[PDB]
Amino acid sequence: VDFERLASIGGIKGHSKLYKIKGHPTTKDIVIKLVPNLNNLTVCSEMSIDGYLNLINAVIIPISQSLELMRNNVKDGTPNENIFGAIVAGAALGIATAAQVTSVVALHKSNQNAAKINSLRDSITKTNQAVEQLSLGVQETVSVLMGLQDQINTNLVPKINILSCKQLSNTLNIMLLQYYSQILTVFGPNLRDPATVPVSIQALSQLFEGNLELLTSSLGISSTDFNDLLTGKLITGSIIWADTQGHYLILRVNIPDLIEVPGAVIQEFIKIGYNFGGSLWMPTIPNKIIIRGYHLSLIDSTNCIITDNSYVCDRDYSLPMNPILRECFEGNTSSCGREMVLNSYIPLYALSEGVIYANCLATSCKCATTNKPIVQSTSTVITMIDNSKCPVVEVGKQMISVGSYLGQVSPNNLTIEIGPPVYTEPVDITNQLGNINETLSKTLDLIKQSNSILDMITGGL
Amino acid sequence: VDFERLASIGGIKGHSKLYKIKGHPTTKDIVIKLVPNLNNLTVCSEMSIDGYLNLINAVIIPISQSLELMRNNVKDGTPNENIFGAIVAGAALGIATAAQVTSVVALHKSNQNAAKINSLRDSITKTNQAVEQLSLGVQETVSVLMGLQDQINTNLVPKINILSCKQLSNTLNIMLLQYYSQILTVFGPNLRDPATVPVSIQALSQLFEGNLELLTSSLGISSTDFNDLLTGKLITGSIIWADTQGHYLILRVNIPDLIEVPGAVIQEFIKIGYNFGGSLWMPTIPNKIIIRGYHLSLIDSTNCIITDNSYVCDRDYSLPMNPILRECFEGNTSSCGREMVLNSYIPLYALSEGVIYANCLATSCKCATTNKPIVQSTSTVITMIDNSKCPVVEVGKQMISVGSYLGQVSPNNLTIEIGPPVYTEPVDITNQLGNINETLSKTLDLIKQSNSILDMITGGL
Amino acid sequence: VDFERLASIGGIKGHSKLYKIKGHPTTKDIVIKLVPNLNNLTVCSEMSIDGYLNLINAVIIPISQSLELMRNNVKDGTPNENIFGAIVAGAALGIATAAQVTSVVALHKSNQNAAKINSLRDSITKTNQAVEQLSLGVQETVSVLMGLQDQINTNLVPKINILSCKQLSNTLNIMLLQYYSQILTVFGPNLRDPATVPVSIQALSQLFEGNLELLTSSLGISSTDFNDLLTGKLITGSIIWADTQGHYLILRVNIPDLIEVPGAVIQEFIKIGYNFGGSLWMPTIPNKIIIRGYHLSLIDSTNCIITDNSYVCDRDYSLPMNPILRECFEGNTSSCGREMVLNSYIPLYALSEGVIYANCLATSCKCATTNKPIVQSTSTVITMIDNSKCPVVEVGKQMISVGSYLGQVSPNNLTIEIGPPVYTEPVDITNQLGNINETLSKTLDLIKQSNSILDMITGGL
Ligand SMILES: *[C@@H]1O[C@H](CO[C@@H]2O[C@@H](C)[C@@H](O)[C@@H](O)[C@@H]2O)[C@@H](O[C@@H]2O[C@H](CO)[C@@H](O[C@@H]3O[C@H](CO)[C@@H](O)[C@H](O)[C@@H]3O)[C@H](O)[C@H]2NC(C)=O)[C@H](O)[C@H]1NC(C)=O
Ligand SMILES: *[C@@H]1O[C@H](CO[C@@H]2O[C@@H](C)[C@@H](O)[C@@H](O)[C@@H]2O)[C@@H](O[C@@H]2O[C@H](CO)[C@@H](O[C@@H]3O[C@H](CO)[C@@H](O)[C@H](O)[C@@H]3O)[C@H](O)[C@H]2NC(C)=O)[C@H](O)[C@H]1NC(C)=O
Ligand SMILES: *[C@@H]1O[C@H](CO[C@@H]2O[C@@H](C)[C@@H](O)[C@@H](O)[C@@H]2O)[C@@H](O[C@@H]2O[C@H](CO)[C@@H](O[C@@H]3O[C@H](CO)[C@@H](O)[C@H](O)[C@@H]3O)[C@H](O)[C@H]2NC(C)=O)[C@H](O)[C@H]1NC(C)=O
Ligand SMILES: *[C@@H]1O[C@H](CO)[C@@H](O[C@@H]2O[C@H](CO)[C@@H](O[C@@H]3O[C@H](CO)[C@@H](O)[C@H](O)[C@@H]3O)[C@H](O)[C@H]2NC(C)=O)[C@H](O)[C@H]1NC(C)=O
Ligand SMILES: *[C@@H]1O[C@H](CO)[C@@H](O[C@@H]2O[C@H](CO)[C@@H](O[C@@H]3O[C@H](CO)[C@@H](O)[C@H](O)[C@@H]3O)[C@H](O)[C@H]2NC(C)=O)[C@H](O)[C@H]1NC(C)=O
Ligand SMILES: *[C@@H]1O[C@H](CO)[C@@H](O[C@@H]2O[C@H](CO)[C@@H](O[C@@H]3O[C@H](CO)[C@@H](O)[C@H](O)[C@@H]3O)[C@H](O)[C@H]2NC(C)=O)[C@H](O)[C@H]1NC(C)=O
Ligand SMILES: *[C@@H]1O[C@H](CO)[C@@H](O)[C@H](O)[C@H]1NC(C)=O
Ligand SMILES: *[C@@H]1O[C@H](CO)[C@@H](O)[C@H](O)[C@H]1NC(C)=O
Ligand SMILES: *[C@@H]1O[C@H](CO)[C@@H](O)[C@H](O)[C@H]1NC(C)=O
Ligand SMILES: *[C@@H]1O[C@H](CO)[C@@H](O)[C@H](O)[C@H]1NC(C)=O
Ligand SMILES: *[C@@H]1O[C@H](CO)[C@@H](O)[C@H](O)[C@H]1NC(C)=O
Ligand SMILES: *[C@@H]1O[C@H](CO)[C@@H](O)[C@H](O)[C@H]1NC(C)=O
Ligand SMILES: *[C@@H]1O[C@H](CO)[C@@H](O)[C@H](O)[C@H]1NC(C)=O
Ligand SMILES: *[C@@H]1O[C@H](CO)[C@@H](O)[C@H](O)[C@H]1NC(C)=O
Ligand SMILES: *[C@@H]1O[C@H](CO)[C@@H](O)[C@H](O)[C@H]1NC(C)=O
């Protein structure tokens, strides 16, 4: 890539950032109960829980039936001389993708630990705090957690005899209907097929009044650096069990780990407007360029958070990049497109390494040390300003100071090649088909005329 | 549609789902009061409700003025000695669309029932619970409801003498300002024209701390099947009265009914990547195809929820399609495009009716029963695997079982007709059309060369 | 612009609205403390504030480091006869844009007032209410504000001895972790570079359970009309100080003011479907047209709120338009494109100035006073109906009265030039591009043949 030609065409090299991808995940199991455990309210609660049970039995049971029907269709057992491999039976899957088969194998792998967690059903249903721990084994533990258990241990419990019992029943019914509406939002796409559709940690934290840090601290991941603070909206978990007796869900989440792809640099660009032809134009180049061993591609930051030093993505998002745009980035300024603007929010100057790239035709350029104006050179459009011209520079309304030097060759003195204008809207490209087509039928008419005139020239002699 | 040629090019038939549209609605009236009724706080509340009244009088009154002005135009009694009905006076409406005139007719139809509800203004303003009923007639009733009437009957009421009166006044002012900010979000677009703009039930349920099931249960709709549980984010409603004395809004909502369009099947397609020309490509086909009497069209699922067995749309979204795409779907795989990728998240195998469609050039394919590798045939690109090859198949890492057979036609032996390499669907191709225009401009130069050929043609003398 | 021809092609003139821009901002200063002040809880709270302090020290300190670096970059000085200020070092700033330099100038301008506010740190840390005032000067005041200061002055405080102290500690820890999760959402992008990134007032009001009116009333903006009532999501603001001892942020916000751009009219358009060629078509025109002294442009209403009478934008959004679209709007109906639909939600009639523009080919048109059908004229496509034809018009199932007069010439007696069908598909444009491929390879072959003829027969004999 040549930055001098691309600076003369109107693109200024910005920051250089690294590239990191989530990869190599380990698994940790949590359990979520859905019916709140009340024991202080054994005096005045009536049978208000029965409506909530009839509301959630239409959600829990169709999850569990599809889960166990997905569980039957994988069977282990040795295929002859080969050792193992947990055969997924394709007779009873109908139509399935690769990720669905991977999820089926994940359930068949997690069956034993699901049974180990399910062996403590009486231990799970007896909790009476928000988040606590239970001893799973000699060194393993579960992290059972319920959002509403605090609210019927510090708000509704002290009004056990001050307030009337029917008011407690009505308030409990209102809060349970609101919470049932909260389950019916996060577990919405899961009801289609609750083995392949995962659960984001932000939507899962929406059950606890938007408390992501409680889930993160109870899970075990503890961020200590600046890059892992904004990261935390991408922990992904899936359902492995949907037990109906205690009305609870056993969930398995993946602890992320940020690996770095070797030798990849993300390059940002600043686009300014230049005055040509009596109009304001901008180059049509993408902002982000991924460079890895003199190989250029495109990425999209539609799901990736941008930190101060590196790009953190969920997964690789490398797209192929144009050979014409490859010539545009490398050497050919004529291959780079342009677009027309007239709006007022177009920047006209920028700073890079103590080097001012300024359009001095529209913005007044001066030097404070000598008090003389700076005029546009006719050979270039974007004006170099460095310390060789003047130290203190008036640009816009601003005193600025400069430094360093040009760098290899100056982009002010060489020739320029302005590319063609590029438009967008489909009526314009239908008219582009038009002025393709009249020119096309001129070329065909010239083919016919020229080929007749060949034989009156070559044939006649 | 022929699935065999489209599987040979790289598109696999997915599930088949039905199509159902909301339609034929009945109407039901609710009322929402805005001033919370306090009678327990007659000792220590001061006149803090007056600021809330002055805040909401700038909202209720300009709604009510336009609401009575839009019903002041339509008049009944068709001049026709025989024909009779409602007439909309177009000279006073100015500029209007069809739905605005339909809403004006709806208000003129609902004026009598709005007056019947307005006849119990003293009954509406005397409520002191969250949701209750009032006797509208001998068999009809209203469902008056207040969001904050629970919170100043179970939280602020018991601290009537423990806490200081100015602290209750400050807390009531903070709660009323927050609630006034909650009215100023949901009734935002309604302030422009409060007769033609409907209200979604999610935005209306945002007033009640996100409790949609409370409004669904108090309205009368009780879903009992799996399809209607996820439905309930599309119940619309419009304002019919904006009474300023009791500061309440009489609202009319439509109970939805899911009707089924006869003989329409929604079909999905799974796209896999095939290795051709030393590169990874996928065919460019839409995922969703509606089929109705051998007629193919296009739908967009941007506002339609997807259930497990059918598509539920708020309204018909049938878009036309190109005849080239019709030939691509029917017989002509040369009319189907292809696009180029190099990313890692491209699936290379899938399962359909026990038949494995796998690209064995990129993924290692083996058989467990015989332990021999499977090689790509040169006459095809996508490899078909059934029980005739081998029962247990090694794909990737997974053991899988297969079943059934080809059905009618086999993609394993058919000829290949991979079409043109179509370029980028977004605007970048126009930039290519830009240099195609530059190609045109060099053919114009060729025309200019034939402006110089026609010169030396005149040197034929 | 001629509305008769544009009504003949299928576009109906809608409402006329004004255009207003937010501009000329003055500055106000607020301070946001982060640690809630507790003094009633000196008996039973333990040291649970220490974990919250260790959580927020990772947020506060890098902001302060980046801010003091940005103050170090600017340097107050005067090279000769200068404006006695500014001066930013190019070497110390690296790579930057214009807005970042403007933000550096803003911090250097607001340093003195930041020190004046910072002189009352002991006054800032001693507050015990939600929002109160402190005397900054003889006529200036600050508006120190805390969101959770109400909730540990009316809810956790009265249960000081009824509830156990460990339950108070657990509830305080849960509330503080939830609030730390609330800081880690609004100041998310601000951690990257905390001097050039603004804070929206809606995201800032999300800390106080979505109470925008509390911030607006405590800030000083008191909107009293209908236009500025919905405005209030565009207040914005930036950070100027990040003090670590009291753990507070000093923020500077802009009080808005709406100015009017002179002589600009925003025009909407209603698009109806017309039946031509046995198909249903709509013209391809933009909805919004800005007209300013015969100068047409395009605007995008993606960030602008639409009131009843005028458009309010955060900033000017004038985009250029194609001259063929200018010919479409002025005189040429053949320059206006069209698109094909078959869906049912296409409006077929409208009303403008008491004049009915209706498509009577698809929808039945009758006159109620005379009881005769209305037939489509072959010369026109869209039927004009006024009081000269019949007063009461059956359209659809509706009575419509008409009036006023026609307006210059009718859109029914003029000729209609239907433009080209704008309908673009990637495979079709790739196929005609392959026609261009074979076309230039024909023209280059014939030009090589004609150049050989230019060589050895122009010098022949
Ligand atoms: C999930 O799997 C269990 C276990 O069945 C095993 O896996 C299946 C995929 C097949 O390969 C089976 O051959 C295999 O054993 C299924 O439970 C079984 O259900 C059937 C009915 O579908 C039961 O048969 C009944 O049993 C008693 C006999 O007294 C009577 O009530 C009836 O006459 C009837 O025969 C069967 O006992 C039961 N268990 C076993 C071990 O086979 C289960 O159906 C399956 N799928 C789902 C969707 O739940
Ligand atoms: C809504 O419609 C009502 C009904 O009147 C109808 O519309 C009018 C514009 C006329 O065309 C009528 O023929 C037609 O029935 C309007 O109510 C009218 O309001 C005006 C004031 O706006 C009243 O005039 C005043 O009323 C009292 C009468 O004691 C005195 O102060 C004055 O002497 C003065 O007349 C008028 O009485 C009243 N009723 C009628 C029958 O005209 C109303 O204006 C209209 N529009 C709106 C925006 O509400
Ligand atoms: C921000 O600015 C402060 C203030 O310093 C002033 O501005 C700088 C840009 C320079 O032009 C300074 O000359 C100018 O006074 C900087 O604080 C200064 O930091 C240095 C270290 O970088 C301190 O030096 C210390 O000196 C003694 C030596 O015995 C020891 O305590 C230490 O080992 C250390 O070397 C210096 O005292 C300090 N203060 C002043 C008034 O100069 C600061 O570094 C700068 N930048 C940042 C990123 O914070
Ligand atoms: C509401 O439910 C709670 C659940 O915690 C009951 O809490 C009770 O709290 C008391 C102290 O306030 C506990 O008594 C003491 O506990 C420890 C452990 O043995 C020890 O210091 C003493 O020996 C003494 O027993 C008590 O254990 C605990 N009870 C239970 C069942 O958890 C509270 O009583 C309930 N309220 C009502 C009205 O029942
Ligand atoms: C808050 O306001 C409400 C409503 O005005 C008041 O509710 C009242 O509650 C009392 C409870 O003692 C009810 O008393 C009734 O007494 C007899 C007992 O023989 C019997 O008829 C009932 O079972 C009932 O207990 C009273 O009817 C009820 N009032 C109404 C209008 O429903 C309440 O007093 C107020 N609270 C305060 C603190 O002022
Ligand atoms: C919890 O903190 C609050 C903070 O406000 C303490 O409030 C105290 O309120 C009482 C009245 O309830 C005040 O006493 C009286 O105030 C007025 C003067 O304004 C006057 O009537 C009397 O001369 C008398 O002073 C009191 O000033 C105020 N502050 C303090 C420090 O007591 C409340 O006491 C705290 N509770 C506990 C248990 O610490
Ligand atoms: C593009 O640049 C190369 C050198 O990098 C040069 O050889 C070639 O002629 C250029 N092509 C143009 C300007 O079309
Ligand atoms: C640019 O070219 C001019 C001559 O045209 C020369 O004086 C100047 O030094 C050049 N700048 C460089 C090589 O940086
Ligand atoms: C296409 O090329 C011609 C000839 O150089 C030029 O006049 C025209 O502006 C070009 N069009 C575009 C859209 O670049
Ligand atoms: C030129 O126009 C004709 C219709 O007159 C059309 O059939 C043909 O495809 C066009 N050729 C192009 C756009 O290259
Ligand atoms: C499309 O396929 C049919 C047979 O399925 C064939 O007759 C026809 O010629 C094909 N059309 C093309 C290749 O354009
Ligand atoms: C496909 O061709 C194979 C030979 O490669 C043959 O065995 C098989 O019967 C063919 N299937 C058809 C024509 O359906
Ligand atoms: C556009 O309209 C003008 C008159 O306003 C006319 O002279 C011109 O020929 C038209 N151009 C077309 C229809 O292409
Ligand atoms: C349209 O022309 C007809 C005659 O063809 C005439 O009757 C009618 O008044 C005209 N409309 C105008 C000039 O608005
Ligand atoms: C069309 O483009 C291809 C590459 O896309 C090129 O090799 C060829 O020369 C062009 N012409 C023809 C006739 O294929």
mmCIF file with all atom_site columns, C-alpha atoms and ligand atoms in Angstrom, chain B residues 331-332 334-335, ligand 11:
data_model
loop_
_atom_site.group_PDB
_atom_site.id
_atom_site.type_symbol
_atom_site.label_atom_id
_atom_site.label_alt_id
_atom_site.label_comp_id
_atom_site.label_asym_id
_atom_site.label_entity_id
_atom_site.label_seq_id
_atom_site.pdbx_PDB_ins_code
_atom_site.Cartn_x
_atom_site.Cartn_y
_atom_site.Cartn_z
_atom_site.occupancy
_atom_site.B_iso_or_equiv
_atom_site.pdbx_formal_charge
_atom_site.auth_seq_id
_atom_site.auth_comp_id
_atom_site.auth_asym_id
_atom_site.auth_atom_id
_atom_site.pdbx_PDB_model_num
ATOM   1  C CA . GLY B 1 331 ? -34.828 -26.000 -14.388 1.00 0.00 ? 331 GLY B CA 1
ATOM   2  C CA . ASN B 1 332 ? -31.959 -23.693 -15.309 1.00 0.00 ? 332 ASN B CA 1
ATOM   3  C CA . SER B 1 334 ? -27.051 -21.812 -15.490 1.00 0.00 ? 334 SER B CA 1
ATOM   4  C CA . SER B 1 335 ? -29.385 -18.939 -14.518 1.00 0.00 ? 335 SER B CA 1
HETATM 5  C C1 . LIG D 2 .   ? -33.938 -24.536 -18.885 1.00 0.00 ? 11  LIG D C1 1
HETATM 6  O O1 . LIG D 2 .   ? -34.156 -25.928 -18.757 1.00 0.00 ? 11  LIG D O1 1
HETATM 7  C C2 . LIG D 2 .   ? -35.079 -26.501 -19.668 1.00 0.00 ? 11  LIG D C2 1
HETATM 8  C C3 . LIG D 2 .   ? -35.316 -27.940 -19.270 1.00 0.00 ? 11  LIG D C3 1
HETATM 9  O O2 . LIG D 2 .   ? -35.474 -28.032 -17.874 1.00 0.00 ? 11  LIG D O2 1
HETATM 10 C C4 . LIG D 2 .   ? -34.543 -26.335 -21.097 1.00 0.00 ? 11  LIG D C4 1
HETATM 11 O O3 . LIG D 2 .   ? -35.497 -26.722 -22.058 1.00 0.00 ? 11  LIG D O3 1
HETATM 12 C C5 . LIG D 2 .   ? -34.212 -24.863 -21.350 1.00 0.00 ? 11  LIG D C5 1
HETATM 13 O O4 . LIG D 2 .   ? -33.582 -24.674 -22.589 1.00 0.00 ? 11  LIG D O4 1
HETATM 14 C C6 . LIG D 2 .   ? -33.308 -24.268 -20.268 1.00 0.00 ? 11  LIG D C6 1
HETATM 15 N N1 . LIG D 2 .   ? -33.123 -22.862 -20.530 1.00 0.00 ? 11  LIG D N1 1
HETATM 16 C C7 . LIG D 2 .   ? -31.955 -22.189 -20.633 1.00 0.00 ? 11  LIG D C7 1
HETATM 17 C C8 . LIG D 2 .   ? -30.682 -22.987 -20.455 1.00 0.00 ? 11  LIG D C8 1
HETATM 18 O O5 . LIG D 2 .   ? -31.908 -20.989 -20.858 1.00 0.00 ? 11  LIG D O5 1
#
